[PDB]
Design a protein around this ligand. Sequence first.
Ligand SMILES: CN1CC[C@H](C(=O)N[C@@](C)(C(=O)Nc2cncc3ccccc23)c2ccc(Cl)c(Cl)c2)C1
Ligand SMILES: [Cl-]
Lengths: 297, 302
Amino acid sequence: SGFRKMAFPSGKVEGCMVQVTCGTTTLNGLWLDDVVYCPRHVIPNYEDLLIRKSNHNFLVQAGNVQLRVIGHSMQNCVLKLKVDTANPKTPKYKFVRIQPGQTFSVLACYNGSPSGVYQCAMRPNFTIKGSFLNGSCGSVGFNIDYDCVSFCYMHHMELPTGVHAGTDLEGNFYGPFVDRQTAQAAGTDTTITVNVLAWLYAAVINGDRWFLNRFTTTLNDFNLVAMKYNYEPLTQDHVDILGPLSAQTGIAVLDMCASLKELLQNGMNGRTILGSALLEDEFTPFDVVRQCSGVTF
Amino acid sequence: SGFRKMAFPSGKVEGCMVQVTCGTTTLNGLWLDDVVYCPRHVICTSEDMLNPNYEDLLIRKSNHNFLVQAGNVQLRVIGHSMQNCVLKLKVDTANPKTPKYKFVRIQPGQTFSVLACYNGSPSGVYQCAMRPNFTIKGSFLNGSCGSVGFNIDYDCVSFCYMHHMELPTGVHAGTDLEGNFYGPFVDRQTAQAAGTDTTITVNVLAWLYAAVINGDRWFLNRFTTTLNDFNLVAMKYNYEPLTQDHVDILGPLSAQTGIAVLDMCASLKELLQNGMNGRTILGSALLEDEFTPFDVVRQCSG
Ligand SMILES: CN1CC[C@H](C(=O)N[C@@](C)(C(=O)Nc2cncc3ccccc23)c2ccc(Cl)c(Cl)c2)C1
Ligand SMILES: [Cl-]
């Protein structure tokens, strides 16, 4: 029993966190094998600014040991500092680009030191509601798949509303954001519907059944309602992905959709679901399964 | 900007997680130096649990009865002792990944990270608090016994909790790393139940100071209160009494925001009275009590 916002164990990522200094700027780097990846804004014609930099301009620090940079290249908005020393703690890893609605763990770092780990989701508006202070640039987002760390995010900036923007580990920004000093704003955000339904299945598994009803709905009727409440449209793939939880609890996906339809029109009415007075959208259907079955890393 | 329920990086604890098997039972152990710590109920059967005599059951045990597994490598148990409700399996190999650590006993209201494990493998990390009724609202399945709670301030891991059981309400009871249970709980199948839970007032105020720092001022008011008037109101909403110790601890937050503690107490009073009225504080429609004043400072400063 119990339901918590749970992150992946951060250990495999911790051994990869380094400090990257260039001039007056100090941020974080991800040291994998003999390459250290970091936001290119550490150095805006970025090809022109990078041509003026020398290898000894980048001071890379792994704990106490200083690493010597032997090369540098740029891939989209990530800088790739080739170092002489390969990371002995390099885990089995992949660079994956996640879709909006997908969740991941963020190991927030300052001066190459991990300060905390938290779970968050890629919002439909391509921002992440993270927790970052100055110096957190280069902190990474990741998932663990068996014994493989899938790096999906590198923090670059904070938007004027306090939400965060960053890139995948190939330097491609999530959303219409750029690493240039200009006016940027997060677009209108929507609720991740498949995740709310997954979190409702986790509540049923945990004993919370008050919100259930005898009703069902069509996928079209549900989406017409969901659209009015700024909820993401629920596709047939979302209905298919929720199948295992639907089987485990005995509540059909459209049956739970009718529960959500009533929750949106009528509300909670003083009641809570998993100790929350709002509908939670930062647990994917796989997160609910992993937590309510006991998958390990 | 931003405010999240943040856990300590679990890496230092991950290298200490081992599998402990004794008979039909498989749970988790914490391998520090040449000792593996685990709940002593690993030696019990389900029938033994009603009225177990642990000293009696431990005397019948041989070192080879405990199968300790660290990853793939099986560890050899060379001794065993019991300290309160924790079993201490002396092993012949010291943990090379042993971090700088302490055994700390926490007070209710204190928060910590839990590295939930199954079969000696870490499955996830989450943040939670020691409730005033001495239970923790964790996320645990069967096989999680031996999972630990910890704080990693500076380069030292302070182990403060070891999971032992789930109570009938779905909440959890455990011990410090010296085997002393938190609360009036025993590692015996009895009619024990968690007492009435209360909201950790000092933590709600700390989380309100985090909201003010983050730009949220809607809940503030032109009122102040006495500490006694606040406690008389707080008690009626099942809130923990706010002591002078709590008022002193909130001082740095009060100075940083410019809002006196009894001033923020008057804001809390009005929120208990009125409710949120469609509004949220740090993206929450409820008043959060699982961030201590130390958590708020660390996250909003460094
Ligand atoms: C289905 N079996 C019936 C009894 C078994 C049972 O509960 N056993 C344990 C070990 C226990 O609390 N384990 C657990 C821990 N955390 C979370 C749990 C979530 C679910 C199920 C067990 C969970 C236990 C039992 C009685 C006592 Cl007094 C103690 Cl100290 C420990 C389960
Ligand atoms: Cl404490």
